[PDB]
Amino acid sequence: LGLDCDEHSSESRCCRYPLTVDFEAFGWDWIIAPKRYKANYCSGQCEYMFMQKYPHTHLVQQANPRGSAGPCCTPTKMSPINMLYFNDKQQIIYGKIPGMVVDRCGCS
Amino acid sequence: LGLDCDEHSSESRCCRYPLTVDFEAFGWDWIIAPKRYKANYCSGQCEYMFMQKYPHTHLVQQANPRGSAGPCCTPTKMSPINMLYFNDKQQIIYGKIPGMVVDRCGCS
C-alpha cells in the first residue's frame, strides 16, 4: 500500500503524484482517443526499509556498496489504457496498451 | 536487454553492477544456506527514452512535470534464490524466496 500526494504535499518520501498526459497538447493527431489521460508519476526519498516490494533491496542497503546511491522511487503497480489510433499502414487500430498508468510507487 | 558494468566502468547510464550479500558477515546465523549470494544492484542515469520497459515513462518525460526528477534506475528483472533457515517456531524451513537477485536494470 503506497502513498498518494498532491503537488503541495509536505511528504518527502516516495509517493505517487497526479499528472495528465495530453496527446492533443503534444500535437499527436495520430491518436484518435483518448485525447488525454491520467498517467501520474513517482517522486520521493527511499530511505532504509521504506516501501520495498523485494527483499533484495534492504539486503543491498545493509551490504552498503560504494557505487550505489541506494534504491529509488519507481512504479510498483501499472495499468493499461485502451487506445484508438492511426498506424503507419493506412489503418485505424484499437488496442489495450499495457504500462500506461502508474497506480502505485515504491522503492527498489 | 540491459547493460552490465564492473565497478571501474566509465558507463554513466543505468547499469547492473555485481554485489555479494554475505549473510555470515551480517552475523545472521539463523540462515543455514546459502552463506552468501550474488545479489547485484542498479545504478546510473536515466536520460530521455533510455532503457524504458513501459510506454508511460517517456510520455511523462515529455509532459515534463515540475515535481519530477525524472525516471530512475531500478531492477527490471528479478529472480529467486533457495534458502534454508531457522524460523521463530523452532523449525528449519526450506523455501524458494522471490525477488532476491537483480538480473537486469532499467529506467521507469
From Swiss-Prot, chains A, B:
Top-level taxon in the UniProt lineage: Eukaryota
Related illness: Vertebral hypersegmentation and orofacial anomalies: An autosomal dominant disease characterized by supernumerary ribs, supernumerary cervical, thoracic and/or lumbar vertebrae, and orofacial anomalies such as cleft lip with or without cleft palate in most patients.
Tissues showing expression: In the embryo, strong expression is seen in the palatal epithelia, including the medial edge epithelial and midline epithelial seam of the palatal shelves. Less pronounced expression is also seen throughout the palatal shelf and tongue mesenchyme.
Subunit-structure text: Homodimer; disulfide-linked. Interacts directly with ACVR2B. Interacts directly with ACVR2A. Interacts with ACVR1B, TGFBR1 and ACVR1C in an ACVR2B-dependent manner. Interacts with FST isoform 2/FS-288.
PTM: Synthesized as large precursor molecule that undergoes proteolytic cleavage by furin-like proteases. This produces an inactive form consisting of the mature C-terminal portion non-covalently bound to its cleaved N-terminal propeptide. Activation of the mature form requires additional cleavage of the propeptide by a tolloid-like metalloproteinase.
UniProt record similarity statement: Belongs to the TGF-beta family.
Entire-sequence positions represented here: 300 to 407 of 407
UniProt function note: Secreted signal that acts globally to regulate anterior/posterior axial patterning during development. May play critical roles in patterning both mesodermal and neural tissues. It is required for proper vertebral patterning and orofacial development. Signals through activin receptors type-2, ACVR2A and ACVR2B, and activin receptors type-1, ACVR1B, ACVR1C and TGFBR1 leading to the phosphorylation of SMAD2 and SMAD3.
Disulfide bonds, paired cysteine numbers: C5-C15, C14-C73, C42-C105, C46-C107
Places the protein is found: Secreted
Protein name: Growth/differentiation factor 11
